[PDB]
């Protein structure tokens, strides 16, 4: 029996219970956005609290973007400008008018409030 730790075990919604996403895994997610015709967008924040609905938009949603390389370049640009911020990639569906995917692509390095995968239970 392993015990799931309550200590510094914060999660960040979709994909946080998986191993950290590789560059190839992130790229595959971006392909999924493009294949489905959804609108990519980046958002960022100094802090991440479950009670806080809005983050700050990086520029504007990438309307009409069908180029995965463009999305990956904006990830680099956003994280470069805010190297200590939480950054997430999201995508919008304008037909249902709702966010249709989203996951973290950066966390602060000074953050020690979450566990590596093999340290989540003791």
């Amino acid at each position: 029996m392993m015990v799931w730790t309550p200590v510094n075990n914060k999660m960040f919604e979709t994909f946080s219970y998986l191993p950290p996403l590789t560059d190839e895994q992130i790229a595959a997610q971006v392909d999924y956005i493009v294949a489905n015709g959804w609108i990519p967008c980046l958002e960022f924040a100094e802090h991440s609290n479950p009670e806080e609905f809005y983050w700050t938009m990086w520029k504007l949603p990438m309307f009409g973007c069908r180029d995965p390389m463009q999305v990956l370049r904006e990830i680099v640009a956003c994280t470069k400008a805010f190297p200590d911020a939480y950054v997430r990639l999201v995508a919008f569906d304008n037909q249902k008018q709702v966010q249709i995917m989203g996951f973290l692509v950066q966390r602060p390095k000074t953050a020690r409030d979450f566990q590596p995968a093999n340290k989540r239970s003791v």
Binding site: M11, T14, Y17, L18, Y32, K96, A117, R120
Partner: protein, 469 residues
Amino acid sequence: TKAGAGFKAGVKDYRLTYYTPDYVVRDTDILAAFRMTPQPGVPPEECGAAVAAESSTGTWTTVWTDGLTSLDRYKGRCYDIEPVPGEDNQYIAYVAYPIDLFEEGSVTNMFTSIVGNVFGFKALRALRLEDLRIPPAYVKTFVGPPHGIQVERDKLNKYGRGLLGCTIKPKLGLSAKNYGRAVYECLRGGLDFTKDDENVNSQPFMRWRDRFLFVAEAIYKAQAETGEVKGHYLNATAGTCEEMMKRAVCAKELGVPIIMHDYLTGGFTANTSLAIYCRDNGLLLHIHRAMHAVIDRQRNHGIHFRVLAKALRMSGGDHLHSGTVVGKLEGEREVTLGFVDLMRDDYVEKDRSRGIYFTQDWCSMPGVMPVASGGIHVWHMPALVEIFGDDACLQFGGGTLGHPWGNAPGAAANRVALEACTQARNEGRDLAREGGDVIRSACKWSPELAAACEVWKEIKFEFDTIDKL
């Protein structure tokens, strides 16, 4: 200067007034598809006409008062009858009802006409309401769901995957303190929701308000620990409207984001009131369909679940249980896919291969989140993600509280399984074919999931389907 049509006392055939095979249906008519089994010697046209008559304006003998009004304007009309393939004595009778027959915004009234008396007529052996065409002009008279799928996701700030829930167990017999204990341990391991069992209301072993308070503490603690928004569907189902409202009011005061209601055992009148209260107060409303299988299981008689689902959508609910297909309770794949579309989508074309008898236009009424619940576990995850997609909540009660390491590891196992399937799908993997591989890889990586994989490895629910198309 002859006499026109006058009052003639006595009995004549219903078909003389109520079978109109040349009737062109109006865009504002409510349409019904009845699977009808006549008694020997009762012509199908007379049977369909009887059903149309006694669900609209007619009775068993001629009444003089018809002359004061216009029967043509108000009568229900059996406008088509088709034989059922593979049956010698089953027919689909199609009945059109003028919009004037119905009280605006009242599912109760609609059911009272269409299914009120006709199922007990001696002249038929069996009757099943298969589908209803709710016209936009009638749909528009309903408040509808308090929020609906898009608004719900926005209120939860949850995107990109199915939601995960869990009924606390044992069903009955736990104290309020133990209920909250179980809830906290469940939510902290990665579940978005837990819930009261449908029959957990207020009882000698656990009074409702004691539960509500402890569950609120549990929600808050798990939310703070995990950094993710949590909820627990607190049951407002009660013996009276006043008790039900008291419970909803208390949940609102506690600031808990979601409650539940058993719409069929509580009833449509109570449910509509509750839905309106939830709209007026920003409460998410989970609907449990307790008692539906009493009505909807048998092919020859009752009301198909798709009609009970449409009725809930109208009365109002943010979630509604949809079956699992693969779990402990019945629900055939194509049937389920059909009513899932009817629950979620804005416009659903007629498709008899999915049990959709009419094209349904919901005219922007919000979609209802399907909830797959009942005897499912980690090995079902790929099939569930494949069937439902992201816009569903998947619930694991036994599949969480039955985990050998307890609730938090159980929740973690389910959350890892869902996320691995979601990722795999997004990457282009075919879950119908490679689902087992996705779970097997995930089991090897996550010790919590592995423990779940081992205990339930052999467990399947495969039986002959009763509710077949």
